[PDB]
């Protein structure tokens with residue numbers, strides 16, 4: 001497959017190789033704050049990242065992934081809408097060419113400069129590859145980024161990007177604490193959806209935090225110096241690696257907060 005975010009291979013083309021692109025529970029979606037309903041049935045969200053073991057950072061030609069050791073319950077997401085235990089495997093971002101676009105989810109049609117995805121898999125399915133074949137296999141924690149003051153906890157990520165400029169490059173990325181990327185509040189919206197890239201599998205419980213984190217213009221400018229292309233190839237800046245909002249269809253977005 002040769003999918004990407006250009007005119008010629010971008011989200012409007014994905015359905016030809018990945019027909020689920022036009023499915024009943026695609027992501028992202030616009031979060032209409034006036035139709036999402038507070039759900040008193042939601043349990044408190046539990047983000048347990050104290051024992052998180054980061055390993056590596058990889059430019060995959062679509063975004064960059066910070067990968068974790070998920071061979072045991074070291075960094076887990078529980079509670080909120082989730083049944084059981086979901087293990088952190090990686091995080092990555094989606095971002096724009098300019099500060100007015102870049103997020104995948106929108107909030108009353110507002111686009112943020114970027115969106116962080118912390119990807120977790122349901123440990124009752126034993127491995128990530130099995131989990132993505134299940135409707136409750138993954139929980140992705142989505143966090144909006146706006147441009148304002150620097151996020152200190154992001155700087156170690158920003159500073160290694162020079163070493164993974166092009167597709168296929170990786171770097172050692174140990175001892176990175178993903179707690180440094182969370183906002184103060186864990187208030188969230190939740191809905192059933194999909195991976196937002198091919199293969200667009202409908203296996204995700206989305207948990208999207210209401211409170212954005214602030215990052216500096218300098219921090220997001222360094223995201224925009226990455227390349228989609230491999231070393232030696234014509235430079236295509238890694239920008240606008242976001243899928244637009246997809247039809248909500250027969251889904252309800254629930255709020256954790258009044």
Ligand SMILES: CC(=O)/C(=C/c1ccccc1)C(=O)Nc1ccc(S(N)(=O)=O)cc1
Nearest residue numbers: 060117119132140194195196197198199201
């Ligand atoms: C190795 C790798 O990158 C992956 C492989 C994979 C995933 C599923 C099936 C086969 C391979 C993967 O995890 N894909 C992915 C993760 C989160 C999101 S998203 N934007 O919905 O959070 C989008 C894409």
Ligand SMILES: [Cl-]
Nearest residue numbers: 110146211212
């Ligand atoms: Cl805001």
Ligand SMILES: [Zn+2]
Nearest residue numbers: 092094117196
């Ligand atoms: Zn993502």
